[PDB]
Design a protein around this ligand. Sequence first.
Ligand SMILES: CC(=O)N[C@@H]1[C@@H](O)[C@H](O[C@@H]2O[C@H](CO)[C@@H](O)[C@H](O)[C@H]2NC(C)=O)[C@@H](CO)O[C@H]1O
Length: 539
Amino acid sequence: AAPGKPTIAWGNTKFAIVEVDQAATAYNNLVKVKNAADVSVSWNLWNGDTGTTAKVLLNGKEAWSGPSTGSSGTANFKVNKGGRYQMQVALCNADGCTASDATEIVVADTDGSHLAPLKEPLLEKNKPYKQNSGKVVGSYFVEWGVYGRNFTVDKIPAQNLTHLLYGFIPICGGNGINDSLKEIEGSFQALQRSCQGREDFKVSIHDPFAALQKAQKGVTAWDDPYKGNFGQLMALKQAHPDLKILPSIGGWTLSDPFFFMGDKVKRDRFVGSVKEFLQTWKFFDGVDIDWEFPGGKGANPNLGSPQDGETYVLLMKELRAMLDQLSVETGRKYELTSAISAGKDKIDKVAYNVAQNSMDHIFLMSYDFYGAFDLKNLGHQTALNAPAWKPDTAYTTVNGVNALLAQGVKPGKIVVGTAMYGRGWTGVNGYQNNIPFTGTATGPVKGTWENGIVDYRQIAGQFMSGEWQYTYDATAEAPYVFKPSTGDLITFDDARSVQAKGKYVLDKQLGGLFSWEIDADNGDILNSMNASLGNSAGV
Ligand SMILES: CC(=O)N[C@@H]1[C@@H](O)[C@H](O[C@@H]2O[C@H](CO)[C@@H](O)[C@H](O)[C@H]2NC(C)=O)[C@@H](CO)O[C@H]1O
């Protein structure tokens, strides 16, 4: 007679190919990449002959075999592909095999293959669009927005994007290497702890709790190996396999290490660590380089060199060569992008006409033209054109685009930026002919989260009523709200100015639109980005 039917023992059924150490703060100890997950199964036979060979089947296919030597047994084996498997134990003898009932096991991998898709409803005023225009529609999600801003990955209107950028992946380094971090409370120290035992100029994760361990929708079970932003982004990938999810390296306070990369020893180490990062976190589709800025004038007044333009071009070439190698190793397409200043003085420090051949998209940061960092010279922070009262205005979207085009940049490489936030001053005074920008300011506007900056959501909800004037400058293509009693002035993007930007992209055959930052929108801005680029409504 064939053996009796085995009973699978109660036990852990969740295993991981990339293991996360739950009691570690250093990136080196936090994640362990393996070739395969170590899986274990046990069984009991309560009735009959135990057979002579015991087998573990995954979807009917043997993953382990051994002699059946007792009424209880244990099998330890490796599984090298993520997913969910119907696991059975079978006991075989010459008269037949008898298989247990199936027990599902989970083999986790960083592509999210073990995760149910994160298909969440659109919130606030977001409306569904199809990504059928062929244009880029991108936005940055910020790692730290899961705290005070309470904006998690399940709130991303993901179907309305082609590109989702994750700000920011840091570059390891202490004194002299990340000094700009020291201006943010605890930020420098958090990176040093993450980078303990890790060489300078390798990438890491700045807030491993937010990125990997904070409970979030769809990743709340204690033995879910990936939680936080990364876990949710994995599940988001499962729901939207065509979404490009790019890690962004740099930003305003994490850009200092780029300035040392004229040393090819450091550059090589950085490029190698980006490759390892992408082999580790398989849901990511490439890399975004947010170096602010080649040549200086970033957060750090002690950094910036005329060599930076050559360093940038070399970095883009070597990153592309690494990504090409990754691409043919995996059969995937990987993208290389960069967020760049839109000011002509900064643009002409770099030969983008050369670098463009390595790059899929240039995210032109056509915003922060004006703000509370300058209380004397006011203007539209993100306008398309110069205003009528100052047609020679240096800092406009068109002037940044024109600088790139004059270098020889192909128009299709250029993605125009929109702002999901306003910048603002207080105490504006001494202006002429009812144009508050011709005056001067006494300080920053009170901000949503920091001085001088207001979420678009708060502008729409709070500063579009009462005493606030509203004006759409049709020459600049830029709205602004003004409270005369206090001199509060805010410059921002709205649905109409975004529409002008989208129409401009289509007319000049540019690459699309991207935005900073996705948590601050109520839907109006992203809706207009999709509509103005010719994306069809619907799902
Ligand atoms: C366009 C331009 O050159 N103007 C400068 C601003 O860009 C710059 O502000 C900084 O802009 C970066 C994007 O270009 C932002 O990412 C960065 O957060 C921002 N920094 C601050 C402090 O807001 C300011 C520097 O303050 O100078 C303008 O000249």
